[PDB]
């Protein structure tokens, strides 16, 4: 029978990783460096939601949410359980998803790899000794048999990889993938269905709070600014990736951060760099033979290197990650075309439109994409469901909505354009937080109809209006026309049929610059 | 036969310790927690200095320094090297002892236990890659075959434990003890002979420097305040245990700190407590089952729990641990009788007397075969177990140094007050001692009026900021004056006996006048 290790301490898990994970080792600072092998990212094509009666009607079935019969799920679960039950060592992690006790979920994770256990210990909330002793029945159970292949001949499967979520039995089965993110995003997906049931708004956004208690959330796909922008010298971090907006305010779903490790350095990201020490995990990163230090710029393994660390590793981060109702709501658009404004103040109507449209770009040359609510791969309900929730929330709490371009400026990424200066974006955020941006004068950005500021402290005027940043006005009109067309097609395919009056009027139009 | 691992990185050594050291593990913060087993302290009774012509005439042979024939040293050395050569893994650590480059020693350490290697990597100075490439032949070699028993029948030995130092061949052999301190104190012993040869003063004291560059040294045996008091929020740490006073100032012999771990906590000693993390070692400490953090109050294994960390783990510690000439010289006396004043400013005459007399306490654990309770002791120059020359030799060096540099000498009671420890008295509040040191460094204590503490003849302050007046004079602190008189009388007799047995015959008139006398307070 397997030797079962229940809720081991971080140092104990590190010890186990070093012993049974062939390629795992310690960095000069004590972080646990490991590799996930074959899969170094999510496998959306292999994600499934079991087709159970309790949720079938609410699940937005399509490219992201794909059905799996209960019979097939039973088959993959059996494969996963038999694999787990036949390992020499089994690791169990009991934790909570959510910092607000009134809404948190009890989760139990079974892993075969010690680093996956450490990851979950770091990424979710660790229960107290008393809570563990009285944990009872978990709400959700994750069977991470990722080191084991699935049977691709099972009806519904398309490969040896399978990440299936059953809302009826409250179970996640992972096969054929050791990428730790699959567990974390599986929990996010669970939250994207349970919160709607409780009428709360799950958000694929980071968040922080100012000294005066003003909360700001930043929506966006991974690698588009959530982690770096929420890390503010003058603001306490609440979380860098996933939050829920309730009647009481917001709460971080996680107990840690799974940040992209690319380019981490003590100069421009001191706090995060310093967090990559003992107790933390380095996933698919390469270490320098000489010093045993991680080469954060080395992507020879993959372009999705990661580090995972508890929230406690970030100075200023809230011990209990909960805070008030968002004063400022930010949409991060990683615009590869370079036509989106550094910042635009959205009206209530535009907020709705831009939120559900989710225009941004996925990182690995940055591919443009429309991702519902800036979290398309994890949504369970239709984009409109969440859009309506946000509209109601922001209206009730008088939240200010902003659109920030974290992509390119002056041209197209595929033509060698330069990225929107991080310094400019931060300057804009400070202006949002200082209250000046909300009081300055605005001008309309033609065609798009976006309201851009005429002036912003520390920010160049030629940047505020994208048109001014482009050398060739002809190329600007051509690119703008192309993107507008993309917005129109996306909208016509996704929301037109049931769109409201305000929505249709928010669809951008092409206005050639005379 | 063995796979030899040379100059590994800290993470590599930790990995090795976890793999081959059965009872080793990591603490909640990443420190390598290990056990030294049978020996959890030094074995002074098993310490030996080889009887070689080059040092025989200078070594103060006696109860501390005991001869070992060159032939017998060859025997233990053979046993050691044989053991080392037959292990599956051998660890080598090349390093420097001494931050002053004109006096530093190249040391090569051979160990079988990975933690002993990590220990020395932390405790001595790590050479630059360039220096390692041109390291060449080491000046001294330590063969730590501590996991292997010695042949007790070997002439000169009295047990299966042997810690021998040969100044001629420049080697230390360790057998029958896995206590890491044996290596550290071996190098200290070497310095206590090599420095005298260059007429520099080796000191069993910690040291730190102020913003203005003023250096302070604190003499004392382990567990009497050297580490605690040198870790000052307002001053940069130089070292916590071993320094040398040269013609240019002072230099730390070590590259880390081997601190007593008993009672460490983030409340009163945050800096030291925070240093116990990845890269550091915890020796004979017990971890809290549910927290994984060291239970710094647990002495179930021994009362000499330790932690070892690089000086780099202490914020503000000097990278190159060297500074100027001590402006203030402090003698720490862990007085269990509660009769020593919290602070006394010593005259030049008293300074020499108190230095060689070395009255303090021998805390439990540090050395083998002790009682779970602290015992008053007279340890020459506050470093008796490690001295090579006679106490008087070092005393004369200090007198000349302090005179030349106008150093101010202070005596601090880091033990008990208001009564005897064995009668339930409370220890000297750390707050008081810290306030006193602040007054020494602010220059106010040197400017206050002093009064004479009768019999002892010690000059005590009439006032010190943040210090209750009734504590400045031990007498006023005791509840029963009769009990105070009887205890002071007992301790005075102990001083007189020690002085007469050790220095009286050849003592100068000035030294003899420093001898305390009993004056009943009526």
| DSSP characters over B170-208 | TEEEEES---THHHHHHHHHHHHHHHHHTT-EEESEEEE
Quote the crossing angle between the two packed helices B348-357 and B481-502, to the nearest 10°: 80
Query: Among this protein's residues, is A78 annotated catalytic?
Result: no
* Look-up of token digits 């799974």: A258
Q: Are A28 and B15 in contact (CB < 8 Å)?
A: no
Question: Is domain A1-23+45-199 annotated with CATH 3.40.718.10?
Answer: no
Nearest to A144 by CA among A123, A169, A120: A120
User: CA B229, B234, B240, B242 torsion: positive or negative?
Assistant: negative
Measured in whole angstroms, the distance separating CA B6 from the mean position of its chain's CA atoms is: 28
List the beta bridge partners of residue A332: A404
Contact A142, A169 (CB under 8 A): no
Radius of gyration of chain B (CA): 23
A6 touches chain B (CB under 8 A): no
Q: Is A224 annotated as a binding residue?
A: yes
Angle at A280 between CA A278 and CA A283, to 5 degrees: 130
Angle at A71 between CA A69 and CA A75, to 5 degrees: 115
Nearest to A226 by CA among A247, A201, A257: A257
Which helix (H) or strand (E) element contains residue B491? helix B481-502
Greatest Cα-to-Cα distance within chain A, rounded to the nearest angstrom: 76
The residue length of chain A stands at 514
The hierarchical CATH code for the domain B1-20+45-199 is 3.40.449.10
Token pair in block for residue A441: 């004068």
Residue of chain B minimizing CA distance to A132: B290
Q: Are A9 and B277 in contact (CB < 8 Å)?
A: no
Q: Cα(B86)–Cα(A157) distance, rounded to whole angstroms?
A: 56
Q: Cα(A446)–Cα(A443) distance, rounded to whole angstroms?
A: 9
Contact B491, B463 (CB under 8 A): no
* Look-up of token digits 């050569």: B85
Q: Cα(A358)–Cα(A342) distance, rounded to whole angstroms?
A: 16
Which helix (H) or strand (E) element contains residue A223? none
Contact A156, A314 (CB under 8 A): no
Query: Among this protein's residues, is A241 annotated catalytic?
Result: yes
Give me the residue spans of the domains in chain B. Answer: 1-20+45-199, 21-40+256-314, 200-255+317-516
* Look-up of token digits 């005379």: A514
Nearest to A450 by CA among A327, A325, A359: A359
CB-facing half-sphere around the CA of A354: CA atoms within 13 A: 26
A25 touches chain B (CB under 8 A): yes
- DSSP alpha helices (H): ranges in A94-140? 114-123, 129-133
Q: Select from A30, A290, A291 the Cβ nearest to the Cβ of B30.
A: A30
Question: Tell me, what DSSP letter sits at residue A461?
Answer: H
* Look-up of token digits 């003499």: B219
- Quote the minimal CA–CA distance from A8 to chain B in Å: 9
Phi/psi at B17 (5° precision): -60, -45
Q: Cα(B210)–Cα(A307) distance, rounded to whole angstroms?
A: 40
Please tell me which residue in A306, A325, A382, A412 is annotated as part of the active site: A306
Q: Cα(B329)–Cα(B395) distance, rounded to whole angstroms?
A: 13
Please tell me which residue in B40, B189, B216, B222 is annotated as part of the active site: B222
Contact B167, B52 (CB under 8 A): yes
For residue B112, the SS3 value is coil
Which of B7, B278, B315 should we substitute to test contact with A (largest number of A Cβ atoms within 10 Å)?
B278
Contact A148, A115 (CB under 8 A): no
List the beta bridge partners of residue A252: A243
Q: Cα(A125)–Cα(B197) distance, rounded to whole angstroms?
A: 61
- Pairing of β B32-34 and β B281-283: parallel
Per-residue 3-state assignment (H helix, E strand, C coil) for A153-218? CCCCCCCCCEEEEECCCCEEEEECCCCCHHHHHHHHHHHHHHHHHCCCEEECEEEEECCCCCEEEE
Contact A113, A148 (CB under 8 A): no
Measured in whole angstroms, the distance separating CA A432 from the mean position of its chain's CA atoms is: 23
Greatest Cα-to-Cα distance within chain B, rounded to the nearest angstrom: 75
Contact A262, A297 (CB under 8 A): yes
Measured in whole angstroms, the distance separating CA A183 from the mean position of its chain's CA atoms is: 13
Q: Cα(B57)–Cα(B257) distance, rounded to whole angstroms?
A: 33
Q: How many CB atoms lie within 10 A of CB A229?
A: 23
Q: Select from B15, B30, B290 the Cβ nearest to the Cβ of A11.
A: B30
Q: Cα(B508)–Cα(B515) distance, rounded to whole angstroms?
A: 11
List the beta bridge partners of residue B333: B413
Nearest to B492 by CA among B357, B364, B370: B357
Phi/psi at B404 (5° precision): -65, -30
For residue A252, the SS3 value is strand
Please tell me which residue in B48, B77, B99, B185 is annotated as part of the active site: B185
CB-facing half-sphere around the CA of B425: CA atoms within 13 A: 25
- Quote the minimal CA–CA distance from B372 to chain A in Å: 32
Cα torsion B399, B227, B172, B161 to 10°: value is 120
Please tell me which residue in B75, B108, B306, B345 is annotated as part of the active site: B306
Q: Cα(A492)–Cα(A500) distance, rounded to whole angstroms?
A: 13
Chain B residues in contact with A9 (beta carbon < 8 A): 28, 291-292
For residue A260, the SS3 value is strand
Which residues precede chain breaks (C–N over 2.5 Å) in chain B?
A: none
Query: At a CB cut-off of 8 Å and minimum separation 6, what does A420 contact?
Result: A342, A405, A406, A407, A408, A409, A463
Token pair in block for residue A68: 């799996």
Phi/psi at A368 (5° precision): -60, 145
For residue B223, the SS3 value is coil
Q: Cα(A509)–Cα(B252) distance, rounded to whole angstroms?
A: 74
Resolution number, Å: 2.0
Which residues precede chain breaks (C–N over 2.5 Å) in chain A?
A: 364
- Quote the minimal CA–CA distance from A36 to chain B in Å: 21
Q: Are A19 and B14 in contact (CB < 8 Å)?
A: no
Phi/psi at B79 (5° precision): -60, -45
Q: Select from A9, A30, A290 the Cβ nearest to the Cβ of B292.
A: A9
* Look-up of token digits 């007469």: B500
Q: How many CB atoms lie within 10 A of CB A493?
A: 10
Nearest to B20 by CA among B38, B47, B2: B2
Query: At a CB cut-off of 8 Å and minimum separation 6, what does B437 contact?
Result: B216, B229, B232, B330, B412
- DSSP alpha helices (H): ranges in A198-290? 226-230, 270-275
Chain A residues in contact with B18 (beta carbon < 8 A): 15, 18-19
- Pairing of β A281-283 and β B281-283: unpaired
Please tell me which residue in B204, B327, B408, B459 is annotated as part of the active site: B204
Phi/psi at B244 (5° precision): -125, 135
B200-255+317-516: CATH class: alpha beta
Radius of gyration of chain A (CA): 23
Residue of chain B minimizing CA distance to A291: B9
- Quote the minimal CA–CA distance from B490 to chain A in Å: 52
List the beta bridge partners of residue A345: A402
Per-residue 3-state assignment (H helix, E strand, C coil) for B66-105? CEECHHHHHHHHHHHHHHHHCCCEEEEEEEEECCCCCCCE
Which of A6, A7, A9 should we substitute to test contact with B (largest number of B Cβ atoms within 10 Å)?
A9
Q: Cα(B163)–Cα(B175) distance, rounded to whole angstroms?
A: 6
CB-facing half-sphere around the CA of A397: CA atoms within 13 A: 24
User: CA B256, B259, B265, B271 torsion: positive or negative?
Assistant: negative
Strand order of the β-sheet with A400-405 is A236-239, A205-209, A215-219, A328-333, A400-405, A343-346
Strands of B228-379 (E only): list them.
Answer: 236-239, 243-245, 250-252, 256-260, 281-283, 306-310, 322-323, 326-333, 343-346, 359-362, 375-378
Q: Which phi-psi region, left, alpha or beta, contains residue B85 (left: φ > 0; alpha: ψ -120 to 50)? A: alpha
* Look-up of token digits 């016509």: A492
Q: Cα(B440)–Cα(B232) distance, rounded to whole angstroms?
A: 13
CA distances from B190 to A383, B51, B52, B59 (A): 76, 14, 14, 12
Q: Cα(B58)–Cα(B393) distance, rounded to whole angstroms?
A: 10
Phi/psi at B97 (5° precision): -120, 115
B290 touches chain A (CB under 8 A): yes
Question: Tell me, what DSSP letter sits at residue A136?
Answer: -
Query: At a CB cut-off of 8 Å and minimum separation 6, what does B168 contact?
Result: B50, B52, B53, B54, B55, B70
Per-residue 3-state assignment (H helix, E strand, C coil) for A108-119? EEEECCHHHHHH
Cα torsion B349, B350, B355, B361 to 10°: value is 170
Contact A341, A403 (CB under 8 A): yes
Token pair in block for residue B404: 């030349």
- Pairing of β B306-310 and β B281-283: antiparallel
Nearest to B431 by CA among B471, B393, B463, B401: B471
Angle at A157 between CA A182 and CA A362, to 5 degrees: 45
Q: Cα(B223)–Cα(B305) distance, rounded to whole angstroms?
A: 11
Query: Among this protein's residues, is B300 annotated catalytic?
Result: no
* Look-up of token digits 């991060």: A332
Chain A residues in contact with B277 (beta carbon < 8 A): 30, 278
- The separation between the first and the last C-alpha atoms of chain A, rounded to the nearest angstrom, is 76
Q: Cα(B257)–Cα(B242) distance, rounded to whole angstroms?
A: 10
Which helix (H) or strand (E) element contains residue A388? helix A383-397
Question: Domain A24-40+256-314 in CATH: superfamily?
Answer: Phosphoenolpyruvate Carboxykinase, domain 2 (2.170.8.10)
Question: Tell me, what DSSP letter sits at residue A127?
Answer: P
Q: Cα(B242)–Cα(B217) distance, rounded to whole angstroms?
A: 10
List the beta bridge partners of residue A105: A97
Contact B33, B18 (CB under 8 A): no
- Quote the minimal CA–CA distance from A287 to chain B in Å: 12
Chain B residues in contact with A10 (beta carbon < 8 A): 28, 292
Chain B residues in contact with A29 (beta carbon < 8 A): 278
Quote the crossing angle between the two packed helices A348-357 and A383-397, to the nearest 10°: 150
Q: Cα(B269)–Cα(B228) distance, rounded to whole angstroms?
A: 7
Residue of chain A minimizing CA distance to B129: A290
Nearest to B46 by CA among B185, B191, B139: B185
Question: Domain B21-40+256-314 in CATH: superfamily?
Answer: Phosphoenolpyruvate Carboxykinase, domain 2 (2.170.8.10)
Nearest to B219 by CA among B197, B243, B190: B243
CB-facing half-sphere around the CA of B411: CA atoms within 13 A: 30
Token pair in block for residue A478: 């051509």
Please tell me which residue in B87, B226, B303, B502 is annotated as part of the active site: B226
- Quote the minimal CA–CA distance from B9 to chain A in Å: 7
For A286-308, the DSSP string reads -B-TTT--B-TT--SS-S--EEE
A11 touches chain B (CB under 8 A): yes
Contact A244, A195 (CB under 8 A): yes
For residue B390, the SS3 value is coil
Question: Tell me, what DSSP letter sits at residue B59?
Answer: S
Q: Cα(B109)–Cα(B117) distance, rounded to whole angstroms?
A: 8
Assign domain A200-255+317-508 one CATH number from 3.90.228.20, 3.40.50.720, 3.90.550.10, 3.30.1600.10.
3.90.228.20
Contact B207, B217 (CB under 8 A): yes
Contact A97, A190 (CB under 8 A): yes
Phi/psi at A389 (5° precision): -65, -50
- Pairing of β A442-445 and β B343-346: unpaired
Residue of chain A minimizing CA distance to B22: A15
Q: Cα(A258)–Cα(A256) distance, rounded to whole angstroms?
A: 7
Q: Are B26 and A19 in contact (CB < 8 Å)?
A: no
Q: How many CB atoms lie within 10 A of CB B3?
A: 9
Q: Cα(A506)–Cα(A501) distance, rounded to whole angstroms?
A: 9
Q: Cα(B293)–Cα(B280) distance, rounded to whole angstroms?
A: 14
CB-facing half-sphere around the CA of A25: CA atoms within 13 A: 17
Angle at B415 between CA B414 and CA B421, to 5 degrees: 170
A28 touches chain B (CB under 8 A): yes
A62 touches chain B (CB under 8 A): no
Query: Among this protein's residues, is B204 annotated catalytic?
Result: yes
CA distances from B322 to B248, B252, B432, B479 (A): 9, 6, 29, 46
Burial class from Cβ neighbours inside 10 Å (0-12, 13-18, 19+) for residue A211 reads: exposed
Which helix (H) or strand (E) element contains residue A245? strand A243-245
Strand order of the β-sheet with B306-310 is B25-26, B32-34, B281-283, B306-310, B256-260
């Amino acid at each position: 029978p397997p030797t079962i290790h229940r809720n081991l301490l971080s140092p104990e898990l590190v010890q186990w990783a070093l012993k049974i994970e062939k390629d795992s080792r310690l960095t000069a600072r004590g972080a646990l460096a490991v590799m996930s092998y074959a899969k170094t990212g999510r496998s959306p094509l292999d994600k499934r939601i079991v087709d159970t009666d309790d949720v079938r009607e609410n699940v937005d079935w399509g490219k992201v949410n794909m059905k799996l019969s209960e019979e097939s799920f039973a088959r993959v679960r059996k494969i996963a359980k038999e694999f787990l039950d036949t390992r020499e060592h089994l690791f169990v992690v009991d934790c909570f998803a959510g910092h607000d006790e009134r809404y948190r979920l009890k989760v139990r994770v079974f892993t075969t790899r010690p680093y996956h256990a450490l990851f979950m210990r770091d990424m979710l909330i660790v229960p107290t000794p008393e809570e563990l002793a009285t944990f009872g029945e978990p709400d959700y159970v994750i069977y991470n048999a990722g080191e084991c292949k699935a049977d691709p001949s099972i009806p519904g499967l398309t490969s040896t990889t399978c990440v299936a979520l059953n809302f009826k039995t409250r179970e996640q089965v992972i096969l054929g993938t050791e990428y730790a993110g699959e567990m974390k995003k599986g929990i996010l997906t669970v939250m994207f269905e349970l919160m709607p049931q409780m009428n709360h708004l799950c958000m694929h956004a980071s968040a922080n709070v100012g000294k005066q208690g003003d909360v700001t959330v930043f929506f966006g796909l991974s690698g588009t600014g959530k982690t770096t922008l929420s890390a503010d010298p003058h603001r306490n971090l609440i979380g860098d990736d996933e939050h829920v907006w309730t009647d009481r305010g917001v709460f971080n779903i996680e107990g840690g951060c799974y940040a992209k490790a690319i380019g981490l350095n003590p100069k421009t990201e001191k706090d995060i760099y310093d967090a990559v020490r003992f107790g933390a995990v380095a996933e698919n990163c390469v270490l320098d033979k000489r010093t045993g230090e991680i080469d954060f710029y080395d992507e020879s393994i993959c372009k999705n290197t990661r580090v995972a660390y508890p929230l406690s590793h970030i100075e200023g981060a809230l011990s209990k990650a909960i805070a008030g109702h968002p004063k400022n709501v930010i949409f991060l658009t990683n615009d590869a075309f370079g036509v989106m404004p550094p910042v635009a103040r959205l009206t209530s109507a535009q907020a709705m439109f831009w939120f559900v449209m989710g225009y941004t770009a996925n990182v690995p040359t940055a591919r443009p994409i429309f991702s519902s609510c800036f979290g398309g791969p994890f949504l369970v309900r239709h984009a409109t469901f969440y859009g309506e929730q946000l509209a109601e929330k922001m209206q009730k709490h008088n939240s200010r909505v902003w659109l920030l371009n974290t992509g390119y400026a002056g041209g197209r990424a595929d033509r060698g354009a330069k990225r929107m200066p991080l310094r400019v974006t931060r300057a804009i955020i400070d202006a949002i937080h200082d209250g000046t941006l909300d009081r300055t004068e605005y001008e309309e950005y033609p065609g798009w109809g976006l309201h851009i500021p005429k002036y912003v402290a520390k920010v160049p005027e030629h940047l505020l209006n994208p048109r001014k940043a482009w050398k060739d006005v002809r190329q600007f009109n051509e690119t703008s026309k192309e993107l507008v067309a993309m917005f129109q097609e996306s909208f016509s395919a996704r929301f037109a049929a049931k769109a409201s009056q305000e929505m249709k009027s928010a669809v951008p139009r092409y206005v050639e610059f005379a």
